Design a protein around this ligand. Structure first.
Ligand SMILES: CC(C)(COP(=O)(O)OP(=O)(O)OC[C@H]1O[C@@H](n2cnc3c(N)ncnc32)[C@H](O)[C@@H]1OP(=O)(O)O)[C@H](O)C(=O)NCCC(=O)NCCS
Ligand SMILES: CC(C)(COP(=O)(O)OP(=O)(O)OC[C@H]1O[C@@H](n2cnc3c(N)ncnc32)[C@H](O)[C@@H]1OP(=O)(O)O)[C@H](O)C(=O)NCCC(=O)NCCS
Ligand SMILES: CC(C)(COP(=O)(O)OP(=O)(O)OC[C@H]1O[C@@H](n2cnc3c(N)ncnc32)[C@H](O)[C@@H]1OP(=O)(O)O)[C@H](O)C(=O)NCCC(=O)NCCS
Ligand SMILES: CC(C)(COP(=O)(O)OP(=O)(O)OC[C@H]1O[C@@H](n2cnc3c(N)ncnc32)[C@H](O)[C@@H]1OP(=O)(O)O)[C@H](O)C(=O)NCCC(=O)NCCS
Lengths: 134, 134, 134, 134
């Protein structure tokens, strides 16, 4: 449980599926959004992706490779590997597994911005400090 | 085309379906949201449901009776009957049809609010004036 | 563990909100589906809303009143009251609370069907014996 | 009508946004799915992503870069560039513009499959003859 902040688990529900009977594009975002939110909560102690009126996180890039399908009722495990690319950027890599078998892998790059001017902004030292602890 | 502001048509797409192969709960909201937005645009000339920083519309109540299923690729027609219940409230009744055959009917009650205090607020006369014209 | 099948807790997420800063129409479906799904699992011990190839639950009617908004981060408690209307239809009444104040109330009505012919069907006694308790 | 199959226009809706006041991850799927669906209809004359019981398209990989945000009400133009990678896989590259400035770029890769066995399958010549034009 030492790395538990990097592990998120849940089941595929009706609203994660479309008529092809497999999880859909937006369902993977719920899964990886839940994983990043927990991580930040437990590692940093702050809300995500809206931290405050002067600091938000927005997605600058996204990628996913869907190796295998996941169906309604599958218990998924998501594994997170955050990489701090700068005082403005984080790549959250993730893997999705069913019973230890990889189904999906990808990443999202998020940028810290001050939403009032809507430009990128350097993350406070407190947050960087928390983020550097494995 | 005189009542065209009350008529909205579109097809059911992949993302309106879940694994039961029929349109899902949120897909009807896209359909009825598109219908109300067009109506307000053409009848009133303003954006919806966020009109400005001092005036928004939020849903206070909703109802739907789903008589028949709609499937991927169905061309749906939505018919709107707005009833102005007060200077603060509108019931947007709707019907959904496939080839003239009713599939769905319901309503949403929307309230005008000033979001800065988050309380109900009376709609300007200009808007009421526009809304009263059939 | 008194009435624990009937109580579900959840938290408002970024994907539950729209630009009005509050939970949107589909979010409430997320909440009540989770509540109903959990109830069925614990009380009947079966999957929901697709039980098997011959037995599905489909929504016939939905209703909600939104007394108060819920926002990103709020924790919520859904209370369920299943009402068995017939050998084949259930009305799942629900309330949403926040810090123990009522924010939302509603119901969905669900009907058991055979999806191969798409007509409603009596719930098996297996299932009805278990639902009939409590 | 030069390259009209490749151009799609859409508008950002309330259901395309989250509490950050901008279009969210799934919204972009809404846009590019509509773009791809329209292209397939006009170029090949078939439904997408479910062509028939023996032929579906499923996403194998997705990628996007979000240069600029889009907001509620913005009109958008999606530009499509289909690249045929094999007898069974297509890479649908896309750009999103707003007031003719680049906001977003990406691709999804789609594979033709038989869903009854769930293995990839060569696209029929009917379909490939039509896709191969332009
Ligand atoms: C259908 C599926 C199993 C593919 O089945 P398969 O036939 O066993 O897959 P293969 O690995 O043989 O792929 C077939 C071809 O596609 C190619 N392919 C797979 N991924 C590719 C990609 N990312 N880019 C380009 N080509 C790709 C393979 O190289 C192979 O090429 P080939 O013509 O040289 O043989 C697929 O992996 C799948 O079900 N993925 C799940 C998709 C999903 O759930 N999508 C969710 C989107 S939200
Ligand atoms: C499956 C469906 C066709 C019902 O099929 P059916 O068997 O032909 O339907 P019936 O009209 O005979 O309904 C069966 C029973 O349910 C009852 N019922 C239907 N709607 C009801 C409701 N709103 N409240 C209470 N009971 C209801 C009927 O009165 C009937 O009662 P009975 O036991 O006295 O015979 C259903 O109408 C349907 O497919 N609706 C589409 C649902 C859908 O697309 N849901 C989308 C949700 S987002
Ligand atoms: C904004 C909100 C608090 C209303 O604030 P309020 O100032 O207390 O508004 P009121 O309760 O006095 O109601 C406004 C008026 O419309 C009427 N009204 C409210 N709900 C109604 C309903 N469901 N049907 C018909 N009329 C209704 C009221 O009677 C009142 O009329 P009145 O002044 O003549 O008495 C509202 O309850 C709310 O925030 N709801 C939650 C919105 C939400 O989260 N939903 C969207 C998610 S899908
Ligand atoms: C806020 C926004 C304009 C960035 O503003 P900006 O101040 O110009 O930020 P920059 O372009 O200088 O990039 C910020 C930093 O992160 C880096 N960065 C940006 N995108 C990156 C990416 N995709 N991968 C790795 N690093 C990246 C930049 O190189 C820069 O680092 P630097 O200062 O060392 O050069 C951003 O482009 C944006 O609004 N994107 C749209 C967000 C959105 O709508 N997406 C969510 C919907 S799903």
């Amino acid at each position: 449980m030492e790395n538990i902040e990097y592990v998120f688990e849940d089941v595929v529900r009706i609203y994660d599926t479309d008529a092809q009977g497999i999880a859909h594009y937006a369902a993977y975002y719920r899964f990886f959004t839940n994983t990043i939110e927990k991580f930040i909560k437990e590692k940093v102690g702050i809300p995500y992706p809206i931290v405050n009126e002067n600091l938000w996180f927005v997605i600058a890039e996204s990628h996913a490779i869907y190796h295998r399908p996941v169906k309604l009722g599958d218990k998924l495990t998501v594994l997170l590997n955050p990489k701090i690319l700068s005082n403005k950027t984080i790549k959250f890599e993730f893997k999705v597994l069913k019973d230890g078998e990889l189904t999906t892998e990808g990443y999202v790059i998020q940028i810290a911005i001050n939403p009032k001017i809507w430009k990128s902004t350097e993350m406070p030292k407190e947050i960087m400090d928390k983020l550097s602890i494995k």
